[PDB]
Design an enzyme around this catalytic site. Structure first.
Site, mmCIF file in Angstrom:
data_model
loop_
_atom_site.group_PDB
_atom_site.id
_atom_site.type_symbol
_atom_site.label_atom_id
_atom_site.label_comp_id
_atom_site.label_asym_id
_atom_site.label_seq_id
_atom_site.Cartn_x
_atom_site.Cartn_y
_atom_site.Cartn_z
ATOM 1 N N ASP A 25 0.871 -1.159 0.000
ATOM 2 C CA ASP A 25 0.000 0.000 0.000
ATOM 3 C C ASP A 25 0.922 1.228 0.000
ATOM 4 O O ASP A 25 2.094 1.123 0.361
ATOM 5 C CB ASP A 25 -0.886 -0.013 1.246
ATOM 6 C CG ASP A 25 -1.659 1.270 1.428
ATOM 7 O OD1 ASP A 25 -2.357 1.703 0.484
ATOM 8 O OD2 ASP A 25 -1.558 1.842 2.527
ATOM 9 N N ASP A 27 -0.161 5.202 0.654
ATOM 10 C CA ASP A 27 -0.409 6.215 1.684
ATOM 11 C C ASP A 27 -0.314 5.589 3.080
ATOM 12 O O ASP A 27 -0.988 4.604 3.377
ATOM 13 C CB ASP A 27 -1.771 6.885 1.477
ATOM 14 C CG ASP A 27 -1.849 7.662 0.168
ATOM 15 O OD1 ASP A 27 -1.103 8.650 0.015
ATOM 16 O OD2 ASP A 27 -2.663 7.290 -0.706
ATOM 17 N N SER A 58 -3.187 0.811 -4.468
ATOM 18 C CA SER A 58 -3.761 1.984 -3.814
ATOM 19 C C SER A 58 -5.219 2.151 -4.198
ATOM 20 O O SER A 58 -5.613 1.795 -5.295
ATOM 21 C CB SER A 58 -2.979 3.245 -4.182
ATOM 22 O OG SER A 58 -3.544 4.391 -3.559
ATOM 23 N N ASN A 59 -6.020 2.685 -3.281
ATOM 24 C CA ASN A 59 -7.412 3.010 -3.593
ATOM 25 C C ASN A 59 -7.562 4.474 -4.004
ATOM 26 O O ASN A 59 -8.654 4.919 -4.339
ATOM 27 C CB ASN A 59 -8.336 2.684 -2.414
ATOM 28 C CG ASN A 59 -8.558 1.187 -2.243
ATOM 29 O OD1 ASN A 59 -8.365 0.412 -3.179
ATOM 30 N ND2 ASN A 59 -8.962 0.777 -1.050
ATOM 31 N N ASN A 60 -6.452 5.207 -3.988
ATOM 32 C CA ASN A 60 -6.420 6.575 -4.491
ATOM 33 C C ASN A 60 -6.647 6.599 -6.007
ATOM 34 O O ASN A 60 -5.989 5.863 -6.753
ATOM 35 C CB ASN A 60 -5.078 7.229 -4.139
ATOM 36 C CG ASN A 60 -5.143 8.747 -4.152
ATOM 37 O OD1 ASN A 60 -5.920 9.338 -4.893
ATOM 38 N ND2 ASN A 60 -4.324 9.383 -3.324
ATOM 39 N N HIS A 175 -9.864 9.804 2.375
ATOM 40 C CA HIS A 175 -8.969 10.071 1.256
ATOM 41 C C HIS A 175 -7.931 11.089 1.740
ATOM 42 O O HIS A 175 -8.293 12.159 2.253
ATOM 43 C CB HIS A 175 -9.771 10.617 0.068
ATOM 44 C CG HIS A 175 -8.929 11.214 -1.014
ATOM 45 N ND1 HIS A 175 -8.119 10.457 -1.834
ATOM 46 C CD2 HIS A 175 -8.772 12.499 -1.413
ATOM 47 C CE1 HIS A 175 -7.500 11.250 -2.690
ATOM 48 N NE2 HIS A 175 -7.876 12.494 -2.454
ATOM 49 N N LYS A 206 -9.225 -2.763 -2.589
ATOM 50 C CA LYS A 206 -8.995 -3.486 -1.347
ATOM 51 C C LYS A 206 -9.960 -2.963 -0.292
ATOM 52 O O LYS A 206 -10.264 -1.769 -0.269
ATOM 53 C CB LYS A 206 -7.538 -3.355 -0.868
ATOM 54 C CG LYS A 206 -6.944 -1.954 -0.881
ATOM 55 C CD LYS A 206 -5.464 -1.997 -0.507
ATOM 56 C CE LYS A 206 -4.773 -0.660 -0.735
ATOM 57 N NZ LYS A 206 -5.036 0.320 0.358
ATOM 58 N N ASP A 231 -0.728 -0.117 6.239
ATOM 59 C CA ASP A 231 -0.841 0.609 7.500
ATOM 60 C C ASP A 231 -2.249 0.577 8.100
ATOM 61 O O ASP A 231 -2.444 1.032 9.227
ATOM 62 C CB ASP A 231 -0.450 2.066 7.301
ATOM 63 C CG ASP A 231 -1.442 2.812 6.436
ATOM 64 O OD1 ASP A 231 -1.528 2.489 5.238
ATOM 65 O OD2 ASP A 231 -2.126 3.729 6.939
HETATM 66 MG MG MG Z 1 -2.475 3.272 3.664
#
Ligand code: MG
EC number: 3.1.3.16
Length: 287
Positions: A25, A27, A58-60, A175, A206, A231
């Protein structure tokens, strides 16, 4: 049976030595806002020289692959290739491409330019683009800075047609913004749309296993030989368990060790990491 053990010494050398790949991941793991985690860029370089695959999840959805790659390079992460980057936007685009295949129709997107770009790169037609009027065959909910009740009502109208797909990039509660602040994530908008339309969305990011399918389409990835490093317990660790990976919690982000331990003693084993490190810099000694 996890565990939440400290990854260092012999354990670390063994666990890292048997590993063929590491999924990170971003961030909270590599960086927070514009603050890079000390030792992160060097670790990635050492892992590559050690012959281990390094992939990023990433989900960004703010950046399509080209721009995401440029960001990695700015923060000091060199020698990465765009193909190693897997965003919820990329996987949503690939899901929709498959479901809308057999060439018809357009995708109505609640989301930003990065998301739109990934969809366009998968050859998808968008409802907001010129030469309009095509039937909307899917609504995609992502992080939407410019959300308005006007567009919610529009989305729900499209969803009156049961054949119109409802897809969400992710259900993250938050976010992260570049300046270190944060704002509600896709989770809130997804629930809004689901509630308004009386539907359940297909979620691609995820902890959904679909993200992992996305990865394994492009790369040879044995989950028993792969580490998942994140994290957040409720997203990254859960993801790792669902995919059959060894999970490592890093403490430079959202979740705390105390939280990890609270899930353990409460019997939520899928939210308990196999191992933890204070930061991913600590993994470097295993090489
Ligand atoms: Mg993260």
């Amino acid at each position: 049976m996890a565990r939440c053990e400290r990854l260092r010494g012999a354990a670390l050398r063994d666990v890292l030595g048997q590993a063929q790949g590491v999924l990170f991941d971003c961030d909270g793991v590599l960086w927070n806002g514009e603050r890079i985690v000390p030792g992160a860029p060097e670790l990635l370089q050492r892992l590559a020289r050690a012959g281990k695959n390094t992939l990023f999840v990433s989900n960004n959805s703010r950046r399509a692959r080209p721009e995401l790659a440029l960001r990695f390079a700015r923060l000091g992460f060199a020698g990465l290739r765009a193909e190693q980057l897997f965003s919820s936007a990329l996987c949503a685009a690939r899901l929709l491409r498959q479901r809308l295949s057999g060439p018809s129709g357009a995708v109505f997107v609640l989301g930003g330019e990065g998301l739109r770009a990934e969809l366009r790169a998968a050859g998808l037609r968008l409802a907001g683009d010129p030469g309009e009027d095509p039937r909307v065959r899917a609504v995609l909910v992502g992080y939407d800075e410019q959300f308005s009740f006007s567009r919610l009502t529009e989305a729900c109208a499209h969803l009156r047609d049961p054949d119109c797909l409802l897809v969400a990039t992710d259900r993250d509660p938050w976010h992260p913004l570049s300046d270190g602040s944060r704002t509600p994530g896709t989770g809130s908008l997804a629930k809004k749309v689901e509630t308004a339309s009386g539907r359940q969305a297909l979620v691609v990011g995820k902890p959904s296993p679909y993200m992992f399918q996305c990865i394994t389409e492009d790369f040879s990835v044995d989950p028993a030989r792969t580490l998942m490093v994140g994290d957040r317990l409720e997203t990254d660790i859960l993801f790792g368990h669902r995919c059959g990976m060894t999970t490592v919690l890093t403490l430079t982000g959202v979740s705390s060790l105390e939280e990890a331990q609270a899930y353990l003693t409460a019997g939520q084993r899928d939210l308990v990491p196999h191992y933890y490190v204070e930061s991913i810099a600590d993994l470097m000694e295993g090489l």
